[PDB]
Design a protein around this nucleic acid. Structure first.
Ligand SMILES: [Mg+2]
Ligand SMILES: [Zn+2]
Ligand SMILES: [Zn+2]
Ligand SMILES: [Zn+2]
Ligand SMILES: [Zn+2]
Lengths: 34, 49, 49, 157, 23, 150, 37, 68, 48, 261
RNA sequence: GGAGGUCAACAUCAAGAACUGUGGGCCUUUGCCUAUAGAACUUAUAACGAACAUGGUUCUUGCCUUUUACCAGAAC
């Protein structure tokens, strides 16, 4: 399973984009909520 | 008839009558055979008329 | 982007189920006791009173 | 085995003759029931049928009283009757059961045929229908089981 | 209801059992 | 990638080898010209379709017609095989797109829409599952479950 | 009063009520698919 | 549930058909529809009847019919 | 004949007695085992 | 009460007496499915009823009463009912109470328990519409009186009044001299239906007058549903009635609407 | 509780000469190897039926004005 597959996300992202990806996922799959 | 077999149909287990008798509308009895022949002739004749 | 993966495993699911509902809805309609082998109160009326 | 006197049929047992007249009065009436007395109205038709069912009931009740009440006949005469279709084996067997002593028919206890639930109102004691009637004060609308013509099979009434 | 009440009560029906008409 | 299937205007279909270009076999069976041919991924099936109003399946194993789908009013110019559903999509001068159930040969869904003949049809796994193009100079993106233009 | 000038839209036939006659060629046949590997 | 079928007097059947012989009333409007339907099942009834022929040594067979 | 309606079983036929069938004389001595039940409708119904 | 309520209904006609089916020889051969005749067309088939009712004489209690059925026996309305007190439906002329019971279901279907159709009928035939409450019967084919010509229209008028008058509460009646038609109007839709089915195909004058014993050869009188009234007067009268009644139900609307809040 | 029933429902009946459960080891559930228990019915001149009908499509024919109805072989 890819890291992209694990997050169920699509495949040169910036360090900023990396942060934003986590933030987006956090909103969706927040462990404290789900 | 020996050369070309058929090898019937499992799930055929459902038959016309077993399905038919189930309903309100069919009732069972005995009767003399000749009488069933005559009834069936009258049945048929009414049907085609 | 092409449409991921676990997105198509959804559309395929719901569409597949829907088409099955149509087909099975048809095969139980038509005149064959044969064709049916290839196949709730549900009403809260008004205020449900 | 058949009603007919076909050569295979074994001759009557001993006690038969005494009861032959009583049975013949039933037979001669069934002749008159199926003669096709014509009627326009539905009610009258299924009334005609009710005649037949009730006659059948009465005959089998006669024999049942002979063997299982008075014991006025032998076992062999009885079995010979059943094999000759003067009686209804299954129906009698219901009569021997606890709750069914007065029963109409075997249709009236059919659970499957009737739409919801089962067992014609033909089987429900008047004692009760008078009570649910009493709640409405509409009296009671029931008269005849459509299959039979029964009014209260239930063995209390 | 009571057994005596029923036994007495039924003979009211016109014709024995069970085709006998209540009323 | 071992071969072609090529329609023709002579009614045949000739299966050519891609490597050397030699001719493997010929599949006859249509009485008029064959407008479209489509081969399946998941299945060993070949769906051909023609101007004779008929969509014929072909079993690649035995090379014989298996099924006929029925119900177009007139010549059927396009077949496309839905990727994941075991469906066919056919279309032609009917001016409607017929979604065929591959197994039972039942024209399950019909897509009313274009005001003229339908030239070319495609299938996609997610939404719009059918794209269509017609001589009314439009291209519609269909939603099949609801059965109307997305 | 001759030729086609148009074709019949299947749309029309889509709105009619079904008859339910049973044809000979829709009787069940080749009732099982085949999947490739 | 499932109580088996209820066997009935033959006189009953004889009365049913014996009645429907003449039908002109309006009360028959379903039964008429009912006849044409059964036209589809007849040849089956012809089979089941004709395979039960009584054979020479028997005088009269007696069978179980299922009637509408 | 075509004009004669089929005669009703509940009247003409049912009263009139069956008039013996084929059978065979058999033999008393040789067939002693099978003489009895051979021509029954269903040959053996009640036997354990 | 003293008349109808106590005295149980009496069989009008013995079942053996009822007319046979298979009406007579309108054509060459009989047809089994539809009940009519085959080839050729005989002179048009219509005939006076051998039967009629007698409101106080026949009508009486029946089983529906105890069973609380809503709907009236039409074979009673034709006085042809052979089931007598055994009948499933009510035998008596509709009153205001019973219409009170029907009031919910009188919208879709007539008093006899038959669904109404939408459009009436080409000739204004048997049963009405559920669009329009129509209380007005057209009486026509007045030659149901056969060929006797009468001293005045007060003969026709008077006789009709005494006919329908029994069948229910009449709001008005007008015979027309020029074109032979009566127009009769009732309080209630129900009585209109009942009277229509009651008096269709009937005869006239006295239990015995003149040609009376030949009455059965007559054609019998059409009772059909009546069109609107073209004259301005009654048109005003309708418009007003509709107005005041609309006004009357606005009271209900504001009472239960006021309860809605 | 025993015998039955021209009673019903639900399972199963054409295949690596072929079934299922369980114990243990390896890979990482599947799958392979090893150990153990039980296998009704149907099969070798092969099959549930010691019997034997029809229909559809596709080819080849045969009658032969054309369609139904057909002639007699094959494959599915
Ligand atoms: Mg031609
Ligand atoms: Zn009963
Ligand atoms: Zn009952
Ligand atoms: Zn009863
Ligand atoms: Zn009545």
């Amino acid at each position: 399973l890819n890291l992209y597959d694990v997050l169920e996300l699509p495949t040169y992202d910036d360090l900023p984009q990396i942060k934003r990806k986590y933030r987006t996922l956090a909103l969706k799959y927040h462990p404290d909520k789900h | 008839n020996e050369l070309h077999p058929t090898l019937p149909t499992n799930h055929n287990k459902t038959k016309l009558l077993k399905s038919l008798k189930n309903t309100k509308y069919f009732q069972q009895t005995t009767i003399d055979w000749v009488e069933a022949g005559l009834q069936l002739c009258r049945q048929g004749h009414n049907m085609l008329n | 982007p092409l449409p991921t993966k676990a997105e198509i495993q959804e559309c395929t699911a719901r569409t597949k189920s829907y088409i099955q509902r149509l087909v099975n809805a048809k095969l139980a309609n038509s005149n064959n006791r044969a064709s049916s082998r290839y196949v709730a109160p549900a009403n809260l009326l008004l205020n449900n009173s | 085995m058949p009603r007919i006197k076909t050569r295979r049929s074994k001759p009557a047992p001993d006690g038969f003759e005494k009861i032959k007249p009583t049975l013949t009065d039933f037979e001669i009436q069934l002749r008159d029931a199926q003669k096709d007395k014509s009627s326009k109205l539905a009610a009258k038709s299924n009334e005609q049928l009710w005649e037949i069912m009730q006659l059948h009931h009465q005959r089998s009740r006669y024999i049942y009283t002979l063997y299982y009440k008075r014991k006025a006949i032998s076992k062999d005469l009885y079995d010979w009757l059943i094999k000759e279709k003067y009686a209804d084996k299954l129906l009698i067997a219901k009569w021997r059961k606890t709750g069914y002593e007065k029963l109409c028919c075997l249709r009236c206890i059919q659970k499957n045929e009737t739409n919801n639930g089962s067992t014609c109102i033909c089987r429900v004691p008047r004692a009760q229908l008078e009570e649910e009637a009493r709640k409405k004060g509409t009296q009671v609308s029931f008269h005849q089981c459509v299959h039979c013509g029964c009014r209260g099979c239930a063995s209390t009434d | 209801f009571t057994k005596s009440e029923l036994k007495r009560r039924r003979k009211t029906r016109k014709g024995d059992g069970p085709w006998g008409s209540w009323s | 990638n071992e071969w072609f299937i090529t329609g023709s205007n002579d009614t045949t279909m000739k299966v050519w080898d891609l490597a050397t270009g030699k001719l493997k076999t010929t599949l006859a069976g249509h009485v008029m010209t064959v407008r479209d041919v489509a081969v399946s991924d998941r299945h060993p099936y070949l769906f051909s379709v023609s101007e004779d109003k008929t969509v014929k399946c072909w079993d690649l194993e035995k090379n014989q017609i298996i099924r006929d789908y029925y119900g177009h009013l007139s010549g059927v110019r396009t077949v496309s095989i839905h990727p994941t559903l075991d469906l066919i999509a056919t279309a032609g001068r009917d001016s409607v797109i017929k979604l065929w159930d591959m197994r039972t040969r039942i024209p399950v869904i019909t897509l009313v829409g274009h005001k003229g003949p339908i030239n070319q049809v495609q299938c996609t796994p997610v939404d719009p599952q059918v794209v269509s193009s017609s001589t009314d100079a439009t291209v519609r993106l269909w939603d099949v479950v609801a059965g109307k233009t997305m | 009063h001759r030729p086609q000038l148009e074709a019949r839209s299947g749309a029309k036939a889509a709105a009619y009520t079904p008859t339910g006659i049973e044809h000979a060629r829709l009787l069940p046949g080749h009732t099982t698919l085949k999947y490739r590997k | 549930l499932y109580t088996p079928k209820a066997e009935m007097p033959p006189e009953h059947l004889r009365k049913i058909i014996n009645t429907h012989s003449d039908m002109a009333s309006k009360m028959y409007n379903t039964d008429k529809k009912a006849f044409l339907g059964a036209l589809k099942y007849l040849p089956h009834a012809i089979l089941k009847l004709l395979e039960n022929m009584p054979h020479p040594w028997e005088q009269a067979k007696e069978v179980k019919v299922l009637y509408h | 004949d075509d004009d004669e309606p089929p005669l009703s079983y509940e009247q003409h036929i049912e009263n009139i007695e069956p008039l013996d069938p084929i059978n065979l004389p058999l033999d008393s001595q040789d067939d002693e085992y099978v003489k009895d039940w051979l021509y029954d409708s269903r040959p053996l119904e009640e036997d354990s | 009460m003293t008349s109808w309520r106590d005295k149980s209904a009496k069989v009008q006609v013995k079942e053996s007496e009822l007319p046979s089916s298979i009406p007579a020889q309108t054509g060459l051969t009989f047809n089994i499915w539809y009940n009519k005749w085959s080839q050729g067309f005989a002179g048009n088939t219509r005939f006076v009823s051998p039967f009629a009712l007698q409101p106080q004489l026949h009508s009486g209690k029946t089983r529906g009463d105890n069973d609380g059925q809503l709907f009236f026996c039409l074979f009673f309305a034709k006085g042809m009912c052979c089931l007598g007190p055994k009948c499933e439906y009510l035998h008596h002329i509709p009153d205001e109470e019973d219409i009170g019971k029907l009031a919910l279901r009188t919208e879709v279907l007539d008093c006899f328990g038959r669904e109404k159709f939408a459009d009436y009928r080409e000739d204004m035939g048997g049963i009405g519409s559920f669009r329009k409450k129509n209380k007005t019967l057209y009486v026509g084919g007045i030659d149901g009186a056969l060929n006797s010509k009468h001293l005045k229209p007060a003969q026709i008028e008077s006789r009709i009044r005494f006919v329908f008058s029994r069948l229910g509460d009449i709001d008005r009646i007008r015979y027309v001299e020029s074109k032979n038609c009566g127009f009769v109007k009732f309080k209630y839709q129900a009585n209109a239906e009942f009277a229509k089915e009651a008096m269709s195909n009937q005869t006239l004058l006295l239990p015995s007058d003149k040609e009376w014993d030949d009455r059965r050869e007559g054609t019998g009188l059409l009772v059909k549903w009546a069109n609107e009234d073209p004259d301005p007067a009654a048109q005003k009268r309708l418009q007003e009635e509709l107005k005041l009644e609309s006004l009357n139900m606005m009271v209900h609307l504001i009472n239960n609407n006021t309860n809605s809040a």
